[PDB]
Amino acid sequence: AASGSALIFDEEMSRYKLLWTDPECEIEVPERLTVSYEALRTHGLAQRCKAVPVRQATEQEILLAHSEEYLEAVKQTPGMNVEELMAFSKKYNAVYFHQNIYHCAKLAAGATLQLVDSVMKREVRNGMALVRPPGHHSQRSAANGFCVFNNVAFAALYAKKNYNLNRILIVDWDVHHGQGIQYCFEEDPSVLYFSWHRYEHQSFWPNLPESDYSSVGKGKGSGFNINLPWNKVGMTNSDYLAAFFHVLLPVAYEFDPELVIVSAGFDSAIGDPEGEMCALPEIFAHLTHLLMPLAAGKMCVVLEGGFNLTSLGQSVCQTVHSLLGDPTPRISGLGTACDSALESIQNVRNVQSSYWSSFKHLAQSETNDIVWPEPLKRMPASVRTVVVPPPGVELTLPKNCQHSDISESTAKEVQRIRDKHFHDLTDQNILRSLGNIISVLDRMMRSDEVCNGCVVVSDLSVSVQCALQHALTEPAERVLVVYVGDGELPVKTNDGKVFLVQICTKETEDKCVNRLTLCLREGESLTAGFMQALLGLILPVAYEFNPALVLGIVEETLMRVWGHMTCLIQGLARGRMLTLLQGYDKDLLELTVSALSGASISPLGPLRAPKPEDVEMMEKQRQRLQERWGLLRCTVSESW
Ligand SMILES: CC(=O)NCCCCNCCCN
Ligand SMILES: [K+]
Ligand SMILES: [K+]
Numbered sequence: 001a002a003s004g005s006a007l008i009f010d011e012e013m014s015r016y017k018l019l020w021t022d023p024e025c026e027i028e029v030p031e032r033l034t035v036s037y038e039a040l041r042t043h044g045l046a047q048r049c050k051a052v053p054v055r056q057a058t059e060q061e062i063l064l065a066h067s068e069e070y071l072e073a074v075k076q077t078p079g080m081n082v083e084e085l086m087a088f089s090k091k092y093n094a095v096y097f098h099q100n101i102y103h104c105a106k107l108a109a110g111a112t113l114q115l116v117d118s119v120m121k122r123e124v125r126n127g128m129a130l131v132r133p134p135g136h137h138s139q140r141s142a143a144n145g146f147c148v149f150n151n152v153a154f155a156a157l158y159a160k161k162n163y164n165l166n167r168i169l170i171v172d173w174d175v176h177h178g179q180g181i182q183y184c185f186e187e188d189p190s191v192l193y194f195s196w197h198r199y200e201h202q203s204f205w206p207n208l209p210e211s212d213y214s215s216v217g218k219g220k221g222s223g224f225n226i227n228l229p230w231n232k233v234g235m236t237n238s239d240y241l242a243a244f245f246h247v248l249l250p251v252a253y254e255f256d257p258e259l260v261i262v263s264a265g266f267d268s269a270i271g272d273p274e275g276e277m278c279a280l281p282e283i284f285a286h287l288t289h290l291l292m293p294l295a296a297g298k299m300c301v302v303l304e305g306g307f308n309l310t311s312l313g314q315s316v317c318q319t320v321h322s323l324l325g326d327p328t329p330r331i332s333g334l335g336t337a338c339d340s341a342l343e344s345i346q347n348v349r350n351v352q353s354s355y356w357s358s359f360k361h362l363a364q365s366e367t368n369d370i371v372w373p374e375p376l377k378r379m380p381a382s383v384r385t386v387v388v389p390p391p392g393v394e395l396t397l398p399k400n401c402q403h404s405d406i407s408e409s410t411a412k413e414v415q416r417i418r419d420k421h422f423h424d425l426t427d428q429n430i431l432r433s434l435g436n437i438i439s440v441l442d443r444m445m446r447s448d449e450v451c452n453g454c455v456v457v458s459d460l461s462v463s464v465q466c467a468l469q470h471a472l473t474e475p476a477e478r479v480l481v482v483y484v485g486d487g488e489l490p491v492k493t494n495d496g497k498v499f500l501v502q503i504c505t506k507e508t509e510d511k512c513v514n515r516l517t518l519c520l521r522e523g524e525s526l527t528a529g530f531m532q533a534l535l536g537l538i539l540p541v542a543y544e545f546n547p548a549l550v551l552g553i554v555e556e557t558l559m560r561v562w563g564h565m566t567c568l569i570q571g572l573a574r575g576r577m578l579t580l581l582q583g584y585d586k587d588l589l590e591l592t593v594s595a596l597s598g599a600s601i602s603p604l605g606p607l608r609a610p611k612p613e614d615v616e617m618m619e620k621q622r623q624r625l626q627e628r629w630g631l632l633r634c635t636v637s638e639s640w
């Protein structure tokens with residue numbers, strides 16, 4: 001029921017800074033906050049967010065994660081002169097103090113708690129806090145790496161205590177390891193912590209052995225700590241997406257969190273002097289988007305690091321755009337993760353194979369300065385989704401959905417198309433279908449007016465043929481076709497314009513690398529199996545293919561997962577998807593339009609394990625396709 005995105009920010013947090021020379025700290029500046037808020041204002045994003053005021057964290061709230069001794073020591077820093085502040089600072093690693101920093105740290109922490117309350121009270125769907133100082137390096141009794149108090153740790157502990165949540169996911173995509181968060185939740189199975197980080201075989205700050213992939217948690221928490229070290233610099237969009245599809249997302253959808261918290265550092269973006277990675281600001285639009293089906297969209301993004309003022313602002317915008325449901329940018333030039341990333345990924349998956357169903361097949365032999373382009377403009381569609389129910393059927397639609405109304409120009413175009421390719425066809429309504437299909441496609445393709453749509457149809461073949469051919473000569477260079485059904489469609493995949501995913505009940509072999517045919521055995525297995533295929537096979541290929549339109553097709557004869565797919569597939573083609581439902585089903589159509597319109601997706605519940613037969617079918621698919629579609633790889637390839 002919740003709507004809106006909270007934006008929590010206050011200028012007071014820009015009113016502390018470094019007072020002496022220190023090259024290790026000089027990158028952390030007040031302008032990080034003002035440049036980011038200014039970019040949100042510039043692009044119209046702040047004005048579309050609910051402004052929630054900041055508050056101080058209380059002393060009892062601070063004590064959730066920190067010791068009285070530490071708190072008492074920090075409480076004294078407002079009274080110190082600069083000499084005393086430098087001497088206090090030097091007791092810790094890579095951190096400076098300022099007379100106002102205790103005050104701002106209490107603000108950064110309270111700002112996060114304000115965000116958790118706004119999302120958990122259903123006052124907003126999700127939100128972001130722009131806070132200084134950052135939090136994820138700080139620990140029970142120490143400030144560390146520009147961090148005073150552990151903002152994100154607070155959020156999880158506050159959410160456990162005040163909302164009795166049993167499963168919280170924390171995604172830390174900052175370029176540094178958040179060891180403070182790891183230490184806090186090491187033994188706690190109710191918080192799943194995932195972090196990637198520049199590591200370089202422990203030679204990169206903070207130089208900890210327990211930042212390696214081997215640290216999986218302790219005791220009852222074993223398996224709920226996931227470290228993915230980057231052992232070279234220059235990681236790219238492909239590396240990041242490979243990490244999500246093959247490590248993070250399989251575990252997250254299996255865990256089924258009730259709240260997602262993001263430790264969102266943008267020192268992992270291109271141009272950052274700390275990360276020296278190569279991922280574009282647009283990738284954070286997808287990182288955000290791919291997590292939003294989780295926890296019914298309850299997602300608290302919390303700013304950590306980020307030190308290239310330009311890439312920080314662009315990356316913050318890409319994130320808020322995604323929180324607001326705006327269409328994702330298309331990611332070009334994706335492919336295999338590099339060898340170093342693949343080594344990290346394969347080591348992580350193997351060490352976590354003891355704890356997670358998505359990796360369990362791995363345990364047994366039988367089983368197995370720089371410049372870059374400014375991001376393009378992301379425009380919410382005037383109306384998001386158009387829907388064409390069968391004639392006579394009116395339905396309750398969200399405020400951002402409309403019914404279609406064939407124009408005379410389109411009616412002639414349908415007449416031409418029947419004149420040429422379909423002579424002996426005169427059914428007046430499976431020809432209104434084609435007028436619907438063509439009219440809804442033109443709104444999707446020819447203007448930012450409409451984003452996506454769904455049409456109910458009767459004859460699959462004529463409908464699919466006209467949709468696909470009208471798409472290709474609009475023109476849209478490539479079209480991803482997703483077909484749940486058992487026939488053979490009028491679809492040609494022998495020219496590179498079309499990739500066909502088919503989820504069917506009859507087992508088939510596909511001959512060529514532009515078709516992916518998944519035959520899952522029906523039963524209580526079906527849902528975990530499908531989600532495994534979606535995350536580990538379908539999304540990897542789709543992202544690399546980079547279609548300009550997605551064509552979804554469902555024959556009259558699964559379902560539980562269809563909203564997750566529809567939501568996730570909108571990362572492709574700027575969300576331009578056309579769904580063709582053969583035969584009227586009230587609730588499938590209602591589910592489709594919900595997810596197409598950007599509404600929250602109901603959770604699946606924690607996932608059981610898929611049938612080993614289904615895993616085998618899927619890995620055979622991977623082996624068959626990963627030479628062509630390298631984003632499928634989650635292992636280093638054999639050298640000649
Ligand atoms: C919030 C954040 O991203 N902090 C990064 C801390 C950087 C410390 N660098 C140490 C340099 C070693 N010579
Ligand atoms: K991290
Ligand atoms: K934990």
Ligand code: NA
Binds near residue numbers: 089090092093095
């Ligand atoms: Na120091």
Ligand SMILES: [Zn+2]
Binds near residue numbers: 175176265267
């Ligand atoms: Zn960082």
